[PDB]
Amino acid sequence: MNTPEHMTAVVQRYVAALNAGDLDGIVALFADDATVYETSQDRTYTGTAAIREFYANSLKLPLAVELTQEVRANRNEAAFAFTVSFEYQGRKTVVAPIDHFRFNGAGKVVSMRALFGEKNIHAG
Numbered sequence: 227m228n229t230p231e232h233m234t235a236v237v238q239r240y241v242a243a244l245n246a247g248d249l250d251g252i253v254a255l256f257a258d259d260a261t262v263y264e265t266s267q268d269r270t271y272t273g274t275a276a277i278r279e280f281y282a283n284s285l286k287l288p289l290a291v292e293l294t295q296e297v298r299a300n301r302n303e304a305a306f307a308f309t310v311s312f313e314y315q316g317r318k319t320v321v322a323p324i325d326h327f328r329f330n331g332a333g334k335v336v337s338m339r340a341l342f343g344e345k346n347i348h349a350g
C-alpha cells in the first residue's frame with residue numbers, strides 16, 4: 227500500500243533520520259533492491275548494503291536537515307526541496323537539493339535521485 231500521505235510521512239522520516247544520524251532509520255525506508263543516485267559523483271548505489279555504506283559515509287559529519295517547502299506527492303512518487311547544513315573545510319555550509327523518491331506498491335522507496343549543483347552550495 228502506498229498513498230501520498232504515506233510518501234510524505236516517509237520524506238519526513240528521512241529528514242528526521244538524517245538529522246539524528248539514524249542510519250538504520252534511513253536504510254529501513256528503502257526496498258531491498260532500491261537504487262540511490264547522487265549527481266555529485268554520478269554514482270548509483272543498488273541494494274541495501276551499498277545504500278547503507280553511502281549513508282554511513284554521508285553521516286560522518288553532523289547534519290542539520292530541514293524541508294523548506296511542502297512535499298510534492300502523487301501516485302507513486304514524491305519530490306521535496308530542502309537544506310543540509312554542516313561544517314566543511316572549516317566553514318558552515320548549506321547545500322540546497324531537490325530529491326525525488328519513487329515508491330513500490332508496498333510503500334518502500336525503490337529509487338532515489340538527489341540533485342544539486344555548484345550554485346546550490348552556500349556559505350553559512
Ligand SMILES: C[C@H](CCC(=O)O)[C@H]1CC[C@H]2[C@@H]3CC[C@@H]4C[C@H](O)CC[C@]4(C)[C@H]3C[C@H](O)[C@]12C
Nearest residue numbers: 283284285287289310312314321323325340341
Ligand atoms: C547527505 C546529504 C544529502 C543526501 C540527499 O541528497 O538526500 C549530502 C548533501 C551534501 C553532501 C556533502 C557535501 C560535502 C562533502 C562531499 C564529499 O565528496 C562527501 C562528503 C560531503 C560532506 C557530503 C556528504 C553528503 O552526501 C551530503 C551532506
